[PDB]
DNA sequence: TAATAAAATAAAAAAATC
DNA sequence: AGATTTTTTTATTTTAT
DNA sequence: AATAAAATAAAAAAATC
DNA sequence: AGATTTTTTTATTTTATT
DNA sequence: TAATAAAATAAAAAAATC
DNA sequence: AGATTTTTTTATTTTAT
DNA sequence: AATAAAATAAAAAAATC
DNA sequence: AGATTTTTTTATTTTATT
């Protein structure tokens, strides 16, 4: 059992913090992918499909943090730009599934190449901690909180992106490459 | 140095973790302020003027993570709803200072009465951690990152809210009241 | 559940750490008190009495992490040196109580004067962390572990020492004094 | 910078934690090894020499947090009990290098099979934390502090012990075996 | 709709001019 | 750029004999 | 039992704002 | 330099969209 | 005891010496 | 410098009519 | 049950390694 | 400078104490 004050204190503090973060993250994310004329959720969708091939609209709307409507509309615009593949399987024909086309994987890799960590603000904001820790910050308390909110299945996005990028990419001339 | 691989690993973990965390906080925040016909940034501006009286447009755009222009446009709607008061100053009339009207302060205080932490998802997410530790999670690594991004003066908002809630408010019948 | 390998991995990591930590704290503690011809458990006994006046030999042994016989022998050795006043009282007389004499209080505070944090190596080892955090490390994970082993009653010594030192003392010429 | 009050608020908190933690580790470690009539520092020496074959007396004293006189005398007693081999090198003859004999390896790995986590207090104190996290506590803050006090070369023992337990041992019938 | 760049604008400060 | 509603569609599911 | 009819509920998909 | 003029800088303020 | 001061002692390197 | 053992000592608990 | 006992337990107080 | 001698430095190695 808890004081109401002590809740307001915790609720307001993590509000400000999570808004400060993500806005900083959103800015650096949209700056990096505007050259390729992708918006944030769009790019997130393509990454959802690369790690989770064949996902359903509601499934990608799960792993990217977006409404089901946003996923359908932004994923069909990725279809017309030729970056996404829609599909249906008629055991249950209410369900529309998406796959990444070759063009889309390509722009993912090219965006991966244009990545410059130094122009990302939380990267630079986290480097102090890394220096004395020996590793980048884990932010485990946040991962615990997120898990209890979204469920362990959601958290599959993390380790699918961890293992895949550790094995599906390498560094040559200071850029990430396949 | 660091690997550009090791960098991406950290950047995708924090990116998704914070989009998760903000969106969760976003919807719970929208839900409690719609009864009084506010949006997040409007409510955010009102709390900033409560804690930082007579602050510049650019200042409340600093403390609330918003653009100067969104600060000025939502700050004017708040005075057309009567909740804010605009002033200018002797030394430099380019600045425009903002104060809370007592209609504005009232709706803040009434919303504080409606606050049910049980309906906030991040709060329920942090309860298991609160039990083990005995106090709420501090997410200290994130406070450090945000600080090295926004700088020490942005971080006065956390301290001013902490002190003000603690010394301006008090519990009665499970609600926070003056 | 846990694998035996995973558990051994944790049990050696903390055994080596707690040994390392305790031994450096042991040396600096001895340096500090050898001038006054005290030993660790004697100095801890006197500090237990200062925070917990009228405490039993068994009770002193709880907070001082020492065997009850160890407390007994070292405690009456302190009475010969005239810093401790034994008592026996009221209903039950198998219990032997302790309080701190005038001579004992002064040697505490005088040792508190000779305190130089820079000669203590664990202080120095935490200074890099304190810069980045703002405050000293909270070492919460071992605080949780130490509680689960010893119980919430035991952890009252932390809480009693925190409050007493905070306002039974003040700083003068780089010295703690009453 | 820091206060002298703030400095000793930290010094006492880690003194008391360190002592509490080392003494529940002390007595759990003793109980485990008395069956094979070893003491803690003798058992440490056997694990130092297993992980670091050919270690010097001084080096053994580094990794096992003990005086060079104790590591010598307890290394001797291990030679008289037939578990450690004493060597010299003709290039520099003031050095004296230690190496486990096969009788020495066998007693270590029978004790490895004797290991029951559930009799260890610190393990059980840590199980609630492993529940929330998914992994055991890392107490990074204590690793940071200990690395600054002892230096990065000492800290090699954690990394070698980690990887050696990982690869040299396997789980058969709920016990760690080679 | 809740935000936001990209202009636009007015005022203060800073820099040029002699 | 990214929501909320509402529609509209399919398939389970639940009834009703 | 079987069915067949009738809500109820999954999953999109299509206008708002 | 001291009195003026010019350019830049700062802070909005409004406008064009997502 | 399970430890560790404190000398004590052999070697080796380092400084000195001319 | 610290314990693990012994002992010893009250008070409490349990067992007996 | 009311007592008195045998037994148990608590808390020191000793002697070892 | 090169060969020598002499000091310090290092690593045990043995003592005695809480
Ligand atoms: Mg933590
Ligand atoms: Mg605690």
mmCIF file with all atom_site columns, N, CA and C and ligand atoms in Angstrom, chain B residues 133, chain C residues 140 143 147 155, ligand 2:
data_model
loop_
_atom_site.group_PDB
_atom_site.id
_atom_site.type_symbol
_atom_site.label_atom_id
_atom_site.label_alt_id
_atom_site.label_comp_id
_atom_site.label_asym_id
_atom_site.label_entity_id
_atom_site.label_seq_id
_atom_site.pdbx_PDB_ins_code
_atom_site.Cartn_x
_atom_site.Cartn_y
_atom_site.Cartn_z
_atom_site.occupancy
_atom_site.B_iso_or_equiv
_atom_site.pdbx_formal_charge
_atom_site.auth_seq_id
_atom_site.auth_comp_id
_atom_site.auth_asym_id
_atom_site.auth_atom_id
_atom_site.pdbx_PDB_model_num
ATOM   1  N  N   . UNK B 1 133 ? 12.057 -3.070 -3.554 1.00 0.00 ? 133 UNK B N   1
ATOM   2  C  CA  . UNK B 1 133 ? 12.944 -2.004 -3.087 1.00 0.00 ? 133 UNK B CA  1
ATOM   3  C  C   . UNK B 1 133 ? 12.422 -1.345 -1.810 1.00 0.00 ? 133 UNK B C   1
ATOM   4  N  N   . UNK C 2 140 ? 21.618 -0.413 -3.899 1.00 0.00 ? 140 UNK C N   1
ATOM   5  C  CA  . UNK C 2 140 ? 20.332 -0.921 -3.450 1.00 0.00 ? 140 UNK C CA  1
ATOM   6  C  C   . UNK C 2 140 ? 20.270 -2.441 -3.530 1.00 0.00 ? 140 UNK C C   1
ATOM   7  N  N   . UNK C 2 143 ? 21.517 -3.800 -0.560 1.00 0.00 ? 143 UNK C N   1
ATOM   8  C  CA  . UNK C 2 143 ? 20.628 -3.463 0.549  1.00 0.00 ? 143 UNK C CA  1
ATOM   9  C  C   . UNK C 2 143 ? 19.426 -4.411 0.581  1.00 0.00 ? 143 UNK C C   1
ATOM   10 N  N   . UNK C 2 147 ? 18.870 -7.193 3.615  1.00 0.00 ? 147 UNK C N   1
ATOM   11 C  CA  . UNK C 2 147 ? 17.614 -7.228 4.368  1.00 0.00 ? 147 UNK C CA  1
ATOM   12 C  C   . UNK C 2 147 ? 16.995 -8.618 4.386  1.00 0.00 ? 147 UNK C C   1
ATOM   13 N  N   . UNK C 2 155 ? 17.893 -3.883 9.732  1.00 0.00 ? 155 UNK C N   1
ATOM   14 C  CA  . UNK C 2 155 ? 18.099 -2.689 8.932  1.00 0.00 ? 155 UNK C CA  1
ATOM   15 C  C   . UNK C 2 155 ? 17.664 -1.409 9.633  1.00 0.00 ? 155 UNK C C   1
HETATM 16 MG MG1 . LIG M 3 .   ? 16.139 -1.304 1.625  1.00 0.00 ? 2   LIG M MG1 1
#
